[PDB]
Scaffold this active site. Structure first.
Site, PDB file in Angstrom:
ATOM      1  N   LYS G  43     -30.792 -51.110  59.908  1.00  0.00           N
ATOM      2  CA  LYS G  43     -30.077 -49.924  60.355  1.00  0.00           C
ATOM      3  C   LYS G  43     -28.737 -49.851  59.697  1.00  0.00           C
ATOM      4  N   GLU G  69     -19.672 -50.205  71.132  1.00  0.00           N
ATOM      5  CA  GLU G  69     -20.226 -51.082  70.139  1.00  0.00           C
ATOM      6  C   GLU G  69     -20.181 -52.499  70.643  1.00  0.00           C
ATOM      7  N   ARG G  70     -21.272 -53.257  70.391  1.00  0.00           N
ATOM      8  CA  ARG G  70     -21.400 -54.641  70.759  1.00  0.00           C
ATOM      9  C   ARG G  70     -20.476 -55.392  69.855  1.00  0.00           C
TER      10      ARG G  70
END
Lengths: 499, 469, 187, 50, 100, 102, 119
Positions: G43, G69-70
């Site tokens: 991705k 976002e992680r």
């Protein structure tokens, strides 16, 4: 240049204010404001805030009045002075809205000068009485095969267009507007429709593409576009269909036939949902407002074909419902279905499988749409709707030992399915549809294998014009088949079928 | 000394008045606020105290100024009834909207009225023949009964009702009331024209029908008391004129809906789904104000728009309770194309007993039900494994059942146009005979499509000849 | 009914008070005594807000009431019954609220219609007088009901003035006109 | 043509900012005082016209 | 802001006026709101739970809520008989039926 | 036979059937038709029970048909909500189990 | 949002070096292109490729806005973006990063998108 326009504007501000009523806002936010004063307010009035935003009073309470903001919260600030517009919510209506994109307030967002408008007329109005209704008889031609005879539509007639999300739902309606290009470029005022395309909950870009499409097909000059984009405030969106329908009524009340396409009322439902929840009224069934039925019914029943005594006009209505998951059971869809007469359900599987547009005939019905029909296209098309809902049954159990009777029906049904197909943005003459339907009904499309049916159709039309456009000219004026026309069609169809 | 008041609040169409006088109109009294658009009729529904009643508003609100003069009309709205109602379409307030000019009132009666006593009730049992094949075989109607439809598409409901009017009300000679609560103006106009055309309304002549029509655009509160008005007109014929009547009510789901709409505004915390926490009582009163007393027999026909077709929804459920017979109409049978769209496994009548329609009739119906239930039962198996790969005994059943399903069809006369097939109306005696034969497989030897969308057995034979060509 | 029903909770007390003293007359007296004890209540710091705030019982509240009627023995008795009511309803944070409301009802009964002329700056006494004259000679205050009018200074308003009373205003400020002008030339 | 239209828009925002500059000048001046007098006498005329 | 059922203005003004009813707070009480077939009466402080109370209209109603000032008496009849400010006199009997 | 929430016509048919079988000569019909008040409907099972107890008291044996307790529950739902009785209970108020159990 | 007038009346196909993209689903101006699939298919690489393509194709800019976002992934993205030089210290920087964090309040989750939009 720019200086002159500025000078015109400065000159265009004149006279000092004369006001003698105001309220001052208490708490504001959630798109509702609570105002102190305005005791002389009319109910459902339009009020103007000092921020310049305007709102409609909904809740008149003994100590406070609760305006609903047709606009954005950022504009408004607490403790502002709201002065009453003095008029119940009205929108300019008149001839000069013709060929103008407008927002729901009536501010021209095409900005083709200030709107030329005869009057303004209140947004909510009661629908014409029983006695003000004369039963329909004048059709609207759609130029789409099945629509224009298997699911025929009248004038003033209320018939649903329901189906799957972004199946290019819009296109079906556009084609109607296009088909009626030569009707509306006609000189017969009875044949003139004036079409309003209400775009609700749609991206401003997408609407602009639509506008450009319409102006490419030069259709804008006979049509109005009302726009209530997604960005526009949720209460404004709520008031958007009602306002559009007022404009339609001015045309209707000129006794002139018209059409209004409300694309998509499903987005009005979400809008009303937002408004209701923000009015902190308990969620209705399926969490959509409890008055959602009322919202739709008051909107929908304004479409009418006025009685001969009281004019002759019409305002045809086709409202476009975006079925979530394509399942017609669901509170908002069913509520609409019960209001409408006839449906134009579209089937996604078929849409993907190249029926453009894919008019499911299991869930498409038309009731009083078939009381306005071209008699020629009533004679040729008789019971074909039944036949192709026998084709539906036959192929149900086809997927087995197939009796010769069923097999013959299946063979006809499949061949007919090929005949049904249309090519988007290509509208067809009514006259031209009459021979084509004769052929298939009389089973002459056995004579052309299924793959080449499309070739036959175009060639047949070219043949018909070349061989004898006399027949089509006759159907153009007579509009009812005679024995001579019937024989001529038998003869002509056999002749072309052979070659 | 008319009670004057001021309009304290206008929160929706549930206006609140504050009477200045210590005189207080009681619950269900009616008030007129003289509107510059006419008048607005409001009906007292709560006393909230401090001389502040809370009133349902029966006409479209707007332009209300808080403080506007109230006048007490007193008691429920009293319509004017008579034989003079016959040949009029009357608004909620009872004023002719078909412009037949003001009714020459005889007796004017309050819209609300108490429901007749247990003693008053008398139980009829006379068969009322319909001539619809499915109706006759599966759920025979009775005269004076309460008949029910539970359709989901009003497009079908209206047609069904129209057929019933076409058959039953021409045969019927007594007075008849059509009350259409919240139904489409265009449809209403169609009925008015049609009725006038079929002479049942003859305006120059005489009308043995009266009409009350309530448009679905009319404000919810108006829709709530359309029903009560019609019941009053009916009561006048039933009681006061003594005549045996008929009554049609469609769409009585709208009665329920209207209540649900007002309920929140009234100040009631809504019950399950959304239906008002007063649903049972309100429904109860309405359906017990429709009765076959010992002073008259009023055959009533009720049409329910089941929302989402979920019968399990409480509002349809509480409708099911007060009906003698029901003939649920559903989307599936509509998809099968069969008009009438009556579910054959979801119909019942109190008259289905063999003590009523005879053992032979009951036996014939029994076999039909069992066969169809089998057919429904093997629908799974048919799909997973071929119908060919079913048992020999079962295949006969399946073939019979496919025929039975198709046989149940019958073109309607009113919608002969819409179907596009010349209508079929078939005798009840003929129907029992015909099905008996088919069950004995007598005519099982000719096309399945010959049974499709056509009437009587003789017609099937003829359609075989047509197909054979 | 009372001159001007302001409605609202805590004004139900005021309404009640008004009508109770209206039918026994001596409303001015009641109001005056109430004002006097209210004023010295604010000017007494413990029970100026630091015992007007709830944290007291009914019984402890009652003993606060007993101290209050020591503060000005003989008020008007209706307002001594009002103190009892307030103790029993255990509200005393909305004590000054009732006082203000009773004043509004009272001076409405008197017909003293106080207004306001918010402006950006303190205005001329000639300006005050001319506006007062005009206002008395206007439809808005036809006179018959006495006119009090207060100019107040609010910096937020930039130039001009706004006359207000009776929920009828003439707003002829500079700031608003500038706003509208700017807006119209931003179009 | 496109830049010509763009230039009209650009001019409009430039002259807009000149208007803002004029506003800052106006609220400075004791025209601010003298126009309050103008508002005052106008308000007298308005309120007398009622 | 608290809103107590004793803040009803007729009650409230009577208290301010000094003099207030008793005994209509024992065996009698005056209706003050009533609608939805559910009355709320002010008084009746000798009421026992589940008792049957005779409305002066002639309605009989059991009492299912004894609230901190207003007894909520569920009507056995239509409220088109009952109307505000009526007196109700306590039957003094929890419901009972003839059995035989 | 206790009939709660049912229309007079239904009840009337039942009594006709019972009179046909001459069984009304030993039966009691306690009825609270749909029209009859929601409090009266709520009270109807418990007073039917009392009638039953009189049989029990005599030492005799008897049988009580409570049709439908479901309609009692709806009646109690409407009663409770009209009382401002706080819990929805999934649409039936908490304590409905206490009512039925007793 | 820009006015009705300011909306452009045609949507031109934005080119991407990926032929597959340009065949089976051509990107276009003002377009919203909704990715489906799971991370780990590449991705990030697909997204990176687009940045590279955009630089050649137009020479425009990008802003990678990450909504909640992680932070593990965020470290990776910064490292990858540095590594592939779409961000390079004193070097060229095309993509601007706004990384959301799930530890930041829900309100700050709502506002990250609007911040990106402004840039």
């Amino acid at each position: 240049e720019v200086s002159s326009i500025l000078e015109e504007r400065i000159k265009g501000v004149s006279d000092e204010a004369n006001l003698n009523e105001t309220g001052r806002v208490l708490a504001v936010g959630d798109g509702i404001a609570r105002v102190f004063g305005l005791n002389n307010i009319q109910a459902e009035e339009l009020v103007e805030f000092s921020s310049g935003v305007k709102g409609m009073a909904l809740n008149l309470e003994p100590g406070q009045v609760g305006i609903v903001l047709f606009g954005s919260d950022r504009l408004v600030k607490e403790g502002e002075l709201v002065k009453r517009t003095g008029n119940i919510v009205d929108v300019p209506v008149g001839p000069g809205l013709l060929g103008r994109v407008v927002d729901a307030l009536g501010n021209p967002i095409d900005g083709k000068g200030p709107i030329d408008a005869a009057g303004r007329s209140r947004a909510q109005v009661k629908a014409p009485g029983i006695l003000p209704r004369r039963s329909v008889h004048e059709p609207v031609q759609t130029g789409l095969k099945a629509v224009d005879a298997l699911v025929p539509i009248g004038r003033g007639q209320r018939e649903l267009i329901i189906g799957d999300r972004q199946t290019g739902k819009t296109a079906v309606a556009l084609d109607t507007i296009l088909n009626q290009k030569r009707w509306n470029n006609g000189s017969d005022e009875s044949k003139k429709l004036y079409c309003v395309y209400v775009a609700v909950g749609q991206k401003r870009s997408t609407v602009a593409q639509l506008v450009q499409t319409l102006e490419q097909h030069d259709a804008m000059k006979y049509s109005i576009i009302v726009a209530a984009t997604a960005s526009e405030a949720a209460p404004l969106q709520y008031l958007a269909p009602f306002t559009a329908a007022s404009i339609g009524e001015w045309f209707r009340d000129n006794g002139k036939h018209a059409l209004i396409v409300y694309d998509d009322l499903s987005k009005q439902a979400v809008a009303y949902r937002q408004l209701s929840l923000l009015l902190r009224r308990p969620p209705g069934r399926e969490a959509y407002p409890g008055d959602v039925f009322y919202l739709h019914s008051r909107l929908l029943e304004r479409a009418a074909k006025l009685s001969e005594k009281e004019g002759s006009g019409s305002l045809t209505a086709l409202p476009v419902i975006e079925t979530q998951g394509g399942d017609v059971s669901a509170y908002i869809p069913t509520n609409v279905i019960s209001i409408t007469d006839g449906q134009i359900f579209l089937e996604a599987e078929l849409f993907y499988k190249g029926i453009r547009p894919a008019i499911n005939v299991g869930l498409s019905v038309s009731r009083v749409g078939s009381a306005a029909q071209v008699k020629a296209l009533k004679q040729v098309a008789g019971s074909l709707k039944l036949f192709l809902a026998q084709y539906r049954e036959v192929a149900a159990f086809a997927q087995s030992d197939l009796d010769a009777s069923t097999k013959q029906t299946l063979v006809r049904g499949e061949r007919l399915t090929q005949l049904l197909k249309q090519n988007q943005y290509s509208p067809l003459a009514t006259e031209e549809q009459v021979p084509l339907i004769y052929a298939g009904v009389n089973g002459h499309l056995d004579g052309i294998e299924l793959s080449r049916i499309g070739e036959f159709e175009s060639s047949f039309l070219s043949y018909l014009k070349s061989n004898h456009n006399e027949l089509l000219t006759e159907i153009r004026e007579k509009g009812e088949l005679s024995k001579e026309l019937l024989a001529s069609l038998k003869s002509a169809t056999e002749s072309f079928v052979a070659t | 000394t008319p009670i004057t008041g001021k309009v304290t609040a206008v929160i929706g169409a549930i206006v609140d008045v504050h009477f200045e006088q210590s005189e207080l109109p009681a619950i269900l009294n009616a008030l007129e606020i003289k509107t510059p658009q006419g008048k607005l009729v409001l009906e007292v529904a709560q006393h909230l105290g401090e001389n502040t009643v809370r009133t349902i508003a029966m006409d479209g609100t707007e332009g209300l100024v808080r403080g506007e003069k109230v006048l007490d009309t007193g008691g429920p709205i009293s319509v004017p009834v008579g034989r003079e109602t016959l040949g009029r379409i009357i608004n909620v307030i009872g004023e002719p909207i078909d412009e037949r000019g003001p009714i020459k009132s005889k007796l004017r009666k309050p819209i609300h009225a108490d429901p007749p006593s247990f003693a008053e009730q008398s139980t009829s049992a006379e068969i009322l023949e319909t001539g619809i094949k499915v109706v006759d075989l599966l759920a025979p109607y009775a005269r004076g009964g309460k008949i029910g439809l539970f359709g989901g598409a009003g497009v079908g409901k209206t047609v069904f009702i129209q057929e019933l009017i076409n058959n039953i009300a021409k045969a019927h000679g007594g007075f008849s009331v059509f009350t259409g609560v919240g139904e489409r103006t265009r449809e209403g106009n169609d009925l008015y024209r049609e009725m006038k055309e079929t002479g049942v309304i003859n305006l120059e002549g005489e009308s043995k029908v009266a009409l009350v029509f309530g448009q679905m655009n009319e404000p919810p509160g108006a829709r709530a008391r359309v029903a009560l008005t019609g019941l009053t007109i009916a009561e006048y014929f039933r009681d006061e004129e003594g005549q045996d009547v008929l009554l049609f009510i469609d769409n009585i789901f709208r009665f329920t809906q209207a209540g649900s709409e007002v309920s929140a505004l009234l100040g009631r915390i809504p019950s399950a789904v959304g239906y008002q926490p007063t649903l049972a009582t309100d429904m109860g009163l309405l359906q017990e104000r429709i009765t076959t007393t010992k002073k008259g027999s009023v055959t009533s026909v009720q049409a329910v728009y089941v929302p989402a077709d979920d019968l399990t929804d409480p509002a349809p459920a509480t409708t099911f309770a007060h009906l003698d017979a029901t003939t649920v109409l559903s989307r599936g049978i509509s998809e099968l194309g069969i008009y009438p769209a009556v579910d054959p496994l979801d119909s019942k009548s109190r008259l289905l007993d063999a003590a009523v329609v005879g053992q032979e009739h009951y036996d014939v119906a029994s076999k039909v039900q069992e066969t169809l239930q089998t057919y429904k039962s093997l629908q799974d198996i048919i799909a997973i494994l071929g119908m060919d790969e079913l048992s020999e005994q079962d295949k006969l059943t399946v073939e019979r059942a496919r025929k039975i399903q198709r046989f149940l069809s019958q073109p309607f006369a009113v919608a002969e146009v819409f179907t596009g097939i010349p209508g079929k109306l078939v005798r009840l005696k003929d129907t029992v005979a015909s099905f008996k034969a088919v069950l004995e497989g007598k005519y099982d030897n000719i096309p399945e499509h010959a049974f499709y969308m056509v009437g009587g057995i003789e017609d099937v034979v003829a359609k075989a000849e047509k197909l054979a060509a | 009914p009372p001159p001007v029903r302001l409605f609202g909770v805590e004004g139900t007390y005021a309404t009640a008070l008004y009508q109770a003293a209206a039918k026994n007359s001596s409303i001015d007296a009641a109001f005056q005594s109430l004002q006097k004890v209210e004023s010295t209540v604010k000017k007494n710091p413990k029970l100026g807000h630091l015992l007007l705030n709830p944290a007291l019982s009914l019984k402890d509240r009652n003993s606060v009431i007993d101290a209050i009627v020591e503060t000005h023995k003989n008020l008007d008795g209706y307002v001594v019954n009002l103190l009892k009511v307030l103790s029993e309803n255990n509200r005393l944070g909305c004590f000054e609220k009732i006082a203000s409301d009773f004043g509004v009802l009272n001076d409405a009964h008197n017909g003293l219609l106080k207004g306001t002329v918010t402006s950006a700056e303190p205005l001329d006494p000639k300006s005050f007088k001319r506006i007062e004259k005009a206002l008395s000679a206007s439809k808005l205050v036809g006179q018959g009901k006495s006119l009090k009018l207060e100019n107040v200074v609010k910096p937020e308003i930039k130039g001009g003035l706004i006359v207000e009373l009776g929920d009828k205003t003439v707003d002829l400020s500079i700031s608003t006109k500038i706003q509208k002008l700017n807006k119209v030339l931003e179009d | 043509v496109r830049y010509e239209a763009s230039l009209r828009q650009l001019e409009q925002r430039q002259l807009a900012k000149s208007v803002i500059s004029r506003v800052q000048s106006e609220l400075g001046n004791p025209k601010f005082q003298e126009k309050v007098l103008q508002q005052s006498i106008s308000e007298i005329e308005q309120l007398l016209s009622k | 802001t608290k809103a107590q059922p004793t803040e009803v203005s007729s009650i409230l003004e009577e208290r301010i006026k000094g003099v207030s009813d008793e005994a209509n707070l024992n065996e009698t009480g005056r209706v003050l709101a009533v609608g939805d077939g559910i009355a709320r009466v002010f008084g009746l402080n000798n009421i026992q739970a589940e008792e049957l109370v005779e409305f002066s209209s002639g309605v009989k109603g059991m009492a299912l809520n004894l609230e901190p000032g207003q007894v909520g008496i569920v009507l056995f009849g239509s409220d088109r008989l009952v109307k505000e400010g009526e007196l109700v006199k306590r039957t003094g009997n929890i419901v009972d039926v003839p059995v035989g």
